[PDB]
């Protein structure tokens, strides 16, 4: 563990094709990356939180505990296993945004 870092699985909705896939997310500094899985050598995408305008809870999904990250180019919809896990991600992400 390292303060400011977090890694774990989250389910996310696709862009054009809105299928939900379980991906491994890692947060270090201001980079939020997601991989196919925990042992994936390379990320599918590297998101820079300096471009993120907000992180908010999302109550409009099929999954109960979801939140989204808003970027000018796209809003990502992610869901955690529990409200607790969702809160952990939301709190650390907002914390990141607060220092930006
Ligand atoms: O796997 P299928 O059912 O074909 O649907 C894919 C996955 O949801 C992708 O997620 P992942 O990349 O995690 O595999 C997603 O890319 P994102 O990563 O941008 O969400 C694609 O969005 P579009 O490329 O926008 O259609 C979507 O077409």
From Swiss-Prot:
Signal peptide: none
UniProt domain PH: residue ranges: 3-98
Effect on the protein of changing residue 89 to L: No interaction with 3-phosphoinositides
GO terms, molecular function: phosphatidylinositol-3,4,5-trisphosphate binding; phosphatidylinositol-3,4-bisphosphate binding; phospholipid binding
Tissues of expression: Highly expressed in placenta and lung, followed by brain, heart, kidney, liver, pancreas and skeletal muscle. Expressed by B-lymphocytes, but not T-lymphocytes or nonhematopoietic cells.
GO CC entries: cytosol; plasma membrane
UniProt PTM: Phosphorylated on tyrosine residues.
Keywords for the protein's UniProt record, in alphabetical order: Cytoplasm, Membrane, Phosphoprotein, SH2 domain
Cellular compartments annotated: Cytoplasm; Membrane
Induction per the UniProt record: Upon B-cell activation.
UniProt record, GO biological process: protein dephosphorylation; signal transduction
Function comment: May act as a B-cell-associated adapter that regulates B-cell antigen receptor (BCR)-signaling downstream of PI3K.
Oligomeric form and interacting partners: Interacts with PtdIns(3,4,5)P3 and PLCG2. In vitro, interacts with PtdIns(3,4)P2.
Protein name as catalogued: Dual adapter for phosphotyrosine and 3-phosphotyrosine and 3-phosphoinositide
């Amino acid at each position: 563990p390292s303060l400011g870092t977090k890694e774990g699985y989250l389910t996310k909705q696709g862009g054009l094709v809105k299928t939900w896939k379980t991906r491994w997310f890692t947060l270090h500094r201001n980079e939020l990356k997601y991989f196919k899985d925990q042992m994936s050598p390379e990320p599918i995408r590297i998101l820079d939180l300096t471009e993120c305008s907000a992180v908010q809870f999302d109550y409009s999904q099929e999954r109960v505990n979801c939140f989204c990250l808003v970027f000018p180019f796209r809003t990502f919809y992610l869901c955690a296993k529990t409200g607790v896990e969702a809160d952990e991600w939301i709190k650390i992400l907002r914390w990141k945004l607060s220092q930006i």
